[PDB]
């Protein structure tokens, strides 16, 4: 890459930080959930991967540039009643104190009679949790990724109505899960909802690059076919 060390280490299933660079394709994707270039669609004159700096850079504040990692939001708020809200997230009861962007809009419990407003495409994620553990922890998994993406996610269902969670056999037992983004509330409160899953996948990869992911994700891909 930049080195012969990085050539050797690329795509070996381990993030090597000496190679965690745009030039080295984030260690052949080892550090970026296998995504070679999360900013491939970004037409900013800035190398936006260098501007994850806790400061607003407007040149990177577009969807294809990953909204500058949401660093152009001014009021960088967290969920005030995070403990209460986590336990009441997606529990089929509207908790008004949790009905805000920071709290993932109570997992859409307060928007139950509102039409779905799906982003185009499907997020395909491999996580190092076996299917049973993922299914049992699905609400927390969805809340965490939703919080990262500033929207609401759900596990996709197949045409039998079954949740699309499948065993994935690697060196560690994992799962492959298919997710959809529901913007039904996001669009009302936010100017930065993903209209398509491509940039959402890339933002997850970006968080992998930084090491700020809350769950042990292995890979993410945005699909239009599924
Ligand atoms: Ca590596
Ligand atoms: Ca920035
Ligand atoms: Ca609730
Ligand atoms: Zn936001």
Resolution in A: 2.0
Expressed in angstroms and rounded, the spacing between residue 8 Cα and the centre of ligand 1 is 8
> Count of CB atoms within 10 A of residue 214's CB?
13
For residue 160, give every residue at least 6 positions away whose Cβ sits within 8 Å of its Cβ, in sequence order, or none: none
Based on the fold, state whether residues 120 and 18 are members of the same structural domain: no
Instruction: Find the CATH number of the domain harbouring 218.
Output: 3.30.70.3310
Tell me which residue of 180, 178, 175 sits closest to 132, measured CA to CA: 175
Rg (CA), the chain: 18
**Cβ-contact 105, 111 below 8 angstroms:** yes
Based on the fold, state whether residues 76 and 56 are members of the same structural domain: yes
Expressed in angstroms and rounded, the spacing between residue 189 Cα and the centre of ligand 1 is 40
115, 136, 158: which is the final residue of a domain? Answer: 115
Based on the fold, state whether residues 153 and 96 are members of the same structural domain: no
**Cβ-contact 62, 44 below 8 angstroms:** yes
Expressed in angstroms and rounded, the spacing between residue 169 Cα and the centre of ligand 4 is 35
Based on the fold, state whether residues 106 and 188 are members of the same structural domain: no
58, 82, 115: which is the final residue of a domain? Answer: 115
Based on the fold, state whether residues 134 and 111 are members of the same structural domain: no
Expressed in angstroms and rounded, the spacing between residue 126 Cα and the centre of ligand 1 is 18
Q: For every residue of the chain, which 3-state class applies, written as one string?
A: CCCHHHHHHCCCCCCCHHHCCCCCHHHHCCCCCCCCCCCCCCCCCCCHHHCCCCCCCHHHCCHHHCHHHHCCCCCCCCCCCHHHHHHHCCCCCCCHHHCCHHHHHHHHCCCCCCCCCECECEEEEEECCCHHHHHHCHHHHHHHHHHHHCCEEEECECCCCCECEEEEECCCEEEEEEEEEECCCHHHHCCCCCCEHHHHHHHHHHHHHHCCCCCCEEEEEEECCC
Based on the fold, state whether residues 103 and 149 are members of the same structural domain: no
Place of tokens 């299933």: 13
Instruction: Find the CATH number of the domain harbouring 14.
Output: 3.30.300.320
Residues forming beta bridges with residue 182, ordered by sequence position: 118, 152
Q: Which ligand is nearest to the CA of 26?
A: 1
Residues with C-beta atoms within 5 A of ion ligand 3: 88, 91, 93, 95, 106, 109
**Cβ-contact 201, 131 below 8 angstroms:** no
**Cβ-contact 178, 118 below 8 angstroms:** no
Boundaries of domain holding 12: 1-115
Based on the fold, state whether residues 16 and 97 are members of the same structural domain: yes
Residues with C-beta atoms within 5 A of ion ligand 2: 51, 53, 57, 68, 71
What distance in Å separates the CA atoms of residue 204 and residue 193, rounded to the nearest whole number? 14
Q: Which ligand is nearest to the CA of 60?
A: 2
Based on the fold, state whether residues 40 and 120 are members of the same structural domain: no
Expressed in angstroms and rounded, the spacing between residue 11 Cα and the centre of ligand 4 is 33
84, 115, 146: which is the final residue of a domain? Answer: 115
- For 105, half-sphere exposure in the C-beta direction (CA atoms, 13 angstrom radius) is 22
Tell me which residue of 73, 76, 69, 39 sits closest to 149, measured CA to CA: 69
Residues forming beta bridges with residue 157, ordered by sequence position: 163
Tokens encoding 224: 């239009």
The number of domains in the chain is 2
What distance in Å separates the CA atoms of residue 34 and residue 118, rounded to the nearest whole number? 25
Expressed in angstroms and rounded, the spacing between residue 9 Cα and the centre of ligand 1 is 4
For residue 130, give every residue at least 6 positions away whose Cβ sits within 8 Å of its Cβ, in sequence order, or none: 167, 173, 174, 175
**Cβ-contact 46, 68 below 8 angstroms:** no
């Amino acid at each position: 890459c930049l080195s012969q060390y990085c050539a050797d280490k690329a795509r070996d299933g381990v993030c090597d930080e000496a190679c965690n660079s745009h030039a080295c394709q984030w260690d052949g994707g080892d550090c970026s959930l296998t995504m070679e270039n999360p900013w491939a669609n970004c037409s900013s004159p800035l190398p936006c991967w260098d501007y994850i700096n806790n400061q607003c850079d407007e040149l990177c504040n577009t969807v294809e540039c990953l909204f500058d990692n949401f660093e152009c939001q001014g009021n960088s708020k967290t969920c005030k009643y995070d403990k209460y809200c986590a336990d009441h997230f997606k529990d089929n009861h509207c908790n008004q104190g949790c009905n805000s962007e920071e709290c993932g809009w109570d997992g859409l419990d307060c928007a139950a009679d509102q039409p779905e407003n799906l982003a185009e495409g499907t997020l395909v994620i491999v996580v190092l949790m076996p299917p049973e553990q993922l299914l049992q922890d699905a609400r927390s998994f969805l809340r965490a990724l939703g919080t990262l993406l500033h929207t609401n996610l759900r596990i996709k269902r197949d045409s039998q109505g079954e949740l699309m969670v499948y065993p994935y056999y690697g060196e560690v037992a994992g799962s492959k899960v298919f997710l959809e983004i529901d913007n039904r509330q996001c669009v009302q409160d936010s100017d930065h909802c993903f209209k398509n899953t491509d940039a959402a996948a890339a933002l997850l990869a970006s968080h992998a690059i930084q090491g700020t992911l809350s769950y042990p994700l292995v890979s993410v891909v945005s699909e239009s076919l599924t």
